[PDB]
């Protein structure tokens, strides 16, 4: 009997008189709580279609909310979602997002959210209907719960779809999402808002836009928050944005928090914390100072020890040290701290196996920076940091005469470059020259690369200040190539190469 009224009500919804259409909409609205009448409207394509057309057309808000609410109730069942879907439900609902009447707006956004969640093919529908831009524009509202629903939709849509990301990007999404993170305290909201940003951060072109809005800073306010899922999202997001944001201001609090995050028991948080700092201290002196000033050096040291064999933690940690140990005020203070905190012995052990190139690559560079400090010369030597360092240079030079993501050329460079600084100490020169390094120190001058030549002359510059060393060089035949590098257009290569021959001139 109930199935006989439906084909009648349909007729009524289509009626012209907006006095009875309201009535029809009201009765239909009431026939949404009954498991029978619902499954009767639901299973009637002409009925559901009639409702959708009415909703978006009947400008009488009292009717628009009855119809919208009706569809809202159909979005709890698979057959309901399907009816809504195949009846052009999405495009209409998307259009209803422009309704100035909150009751209507809430029905739409909510139902849409259900559709996206459980109805397959709903994502394209919202995308095609200009839903992305309309949602991003709705990030102006101050309703924490409404924002939570809207931000989750965007995430669902943006996940796996590059175009959606580019769209959100162009819609000013980054600026809006950032404001939520730095305005609202509602966890659910903040959490789902981060998930959105996480999805956006993987996109190269989306990355900068986020950093400009002040994403780095905003994400750092919640690294302390109780919510595990919230923190674990800001870490993954920052580890993505990090490499880019080497120009930002007011990063202290963040840098500081990242430092003490290196202490968390959760090894996974320590991993991100280090990976992030490694990128923020890269060619950024202000970030290097800030880190050292909050005891960053000491922390990273502990991190390395606490890591151990696992190169997943040591790699980012070492790079961060490699950074903090040069080109700023507390550069010296940093080189001392690494020694003072008993980090020298362990670092050398990192050159030796079973370590890999990506690790060895960073370790050598750090040793170079640690050699700058005079009070590190002796300690480093004692740890056999010379025999093993050159040992790796020999194995690195053979592989270029005849990997793991690292080219052997720059490995050959890092070795010699470190030995340069690590030759200011007299005792060091003795060991260096006592391991027959001169013969191959000359072949480095025949290197096509300007970098290899630049350090190949600097090391011999330190060795040349001796007598028993200046002769072994000329006896090998290095007196000729040195004369050639005098003209090298490279500003650096032409500086040491000149001082080398000179040292052999005034004995």
């Amino acid at each position: 009997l109930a199935t006989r009224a439906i084909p009648e009500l349909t007729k009524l919804l289509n009626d012209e008189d907006q006095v009875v259409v309201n009535k029809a909409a009201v009765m239909v609205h009431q026939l949404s709580k009954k498991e029978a009448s619902r499954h009767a409207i639901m299973r009637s394509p002409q009925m559901v279609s009639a409702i959708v057309r009415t909703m978006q057309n009947t400008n009488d808000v009292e009717t628009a909310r009855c119809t919208a609410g009706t569809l809202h109730n159909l979005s709890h069942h698979r057959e309901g979602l399907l009816a809504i879907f195949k009846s052009g439900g999405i495009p209409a609902l998307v259009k209803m997002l422009g309704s100035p009447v909150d009751s209507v707006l809430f029905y739409a956004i909510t139902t849409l959210h259900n559709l996206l969640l459980h109805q397959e093919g709903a994502k394209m529908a919202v995308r095609l209907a200009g839903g992305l831009q309309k949602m991003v524009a709705l990030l102006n509202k101050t309703n924490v719960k409404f924002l939570a629903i809207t931000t989750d939709c965007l995430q669902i849509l943006a996940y796996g779809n590059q175009e959606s990301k580019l769209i959100i990007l162009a819609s000013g999404g980054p600026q809006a999402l950032v404001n939520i993170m730095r305005t609202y305290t509602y966890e659910k909201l903040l959490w789902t808002t981060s998930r959105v940003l996480k999805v956006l951060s993987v996109c190269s072109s989306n990355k900068p836009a986020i950093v400009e809005a002040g994403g780095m800073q905003a994400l750092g306010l919640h690294l302390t928050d109780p919510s595990q899922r919230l923190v674990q999202n800001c870490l993954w997001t920052l580890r993505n944005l990090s490499d880019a944001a080497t120009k930002q201001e007011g990063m202290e609090g963040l840098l500081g928090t990242l430092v003490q995050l290196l202490g968390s028991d959760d090894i996974n948080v320590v991993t991100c914390a280090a990976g992030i700092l490694s990128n923020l201290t890269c060619n950024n002196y202000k970030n290097k100072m800030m880190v050292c000033q909050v005891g960053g050096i000491e922390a990273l040291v502990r991190t390395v020890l606490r890591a151990g064999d696992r190169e997943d933690i040591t790699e980012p940690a070492i790079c961060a040290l490699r950074h903090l140990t040069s080109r700023h005020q507390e550069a010296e203070m940093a080189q001392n701290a690494v020694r003072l905190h008993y980090g020298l012995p362990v670092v050398v052990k990192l050159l030796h196996p079973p370590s890999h190139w990506p690790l060895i690559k960073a370790t050598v560079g750090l040793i170079r920076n640690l050699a700058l400090c005079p009070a590190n010369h002796a300690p480093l030597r004692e740890q056999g940091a010379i025999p093993r360092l050159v040992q790796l240079l020999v194995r690195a030079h053979q592989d270029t005469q005849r990997v793991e993501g690292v080219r052997m050329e720059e490995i050959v460079e890092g070795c010699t470059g470190a030995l340069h600084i690590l030759a200011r100490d007299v005792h060091n020169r003795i060991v260096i020259r006592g391991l027959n390094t001169i013969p191959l120190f000359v072949q480095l001058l025949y290197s096509p690369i300007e970098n290899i030549q630049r350090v190949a002359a600097g090391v011999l510059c330190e060795l040349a200040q001796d007598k028993e060393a200046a002769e072994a060089i000329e006896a090998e035949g290095a007196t000729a190539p040195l004369t050639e590098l005098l003209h090298s257009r490279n500003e650096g290569v032409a500086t040491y190469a000149a001082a080398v021959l000179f040292r052999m001139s005034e004995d």
């Binding site: 909150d102 009751s103 809430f106 029905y107 909510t110 959210h113 309703n143 719960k145 939570a148 629903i149």
Partner: peptide
């Protein structure tokens, strides 16, 4: 609690 209602019963349904 209107029309806030609408969002609150929905949140419960999902989150």
């Amino acid at each position: 609690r209107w029309p806030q209602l609408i969002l609150d019963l929905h949140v419960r349904r999902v989150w």
